[model samples]
Target: MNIYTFDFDEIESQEDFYRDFSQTFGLAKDKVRDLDSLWDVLMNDVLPLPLEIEFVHLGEKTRRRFGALILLFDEAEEELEGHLRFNVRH
Candidate 1:
């Protein structure tokens, strides 16, 4: 089980989100800027979530970025890849 609680309070705006997450993984600047566009591609064009969501996080409170724990019971195979690859290298 891997869990990472990011303290984005120190982070400022949407641009800051891209910058911090990009810096965390040494991502290219262009790739970071493409995040918004990527969101549009994923949420708007590709596999969209069940409902309309504008996922906003503002001030003081901490939210559970993920609810249920992802169970990795497939002997580290393709089925459980999401859990197997999730981590905080930094």
Candidate 2:
């Protein structure tokens, strides 16, 4: 299995990331703003289902901003990996 990693240094905070990610992923608004919230969604809501999803969070917290890089393995075993690059405006 191949490992996939994402790096995003542009976003300013986890809250900013949470809202944007929720909208992009079609999750409920304000859903992933903190580690606790993200845990609830992952444990009780999404991960238990038939859909295959797994990831590791290298979460970031800083003086000015918070962000994270999530790592996961793709299921298809294809040579190519898929990605989504988000662009946001304040």
Per-residue accuracy of model 2 over 1-90 as CA lDDT, tens digit each: 222222244445566555655664568867677766765564453422333322223243342233232311221212123332222212
Model 2 residue pairs with clashes: none
TM-score of 2: 0.41
All candidates' lDDT scores?
A: 0.36, 0.40
TM-score of each: 0.38, 0.41
Error of 2 at 56 (Å): 14
lDDT of 1 by residue, 1-90 (tens): 323233545645456655654565455665646444433333332322221212233333322332111112122223333433333212
Best by lDDT: 2
| Model 1 alpha-carbon miss at residue 65, Å | 14
Q: Pick the candidate with the highest TM-score.
A: 2
Point out where model 1 deviates above 4 Å. 1-5, 34-81, 84-90
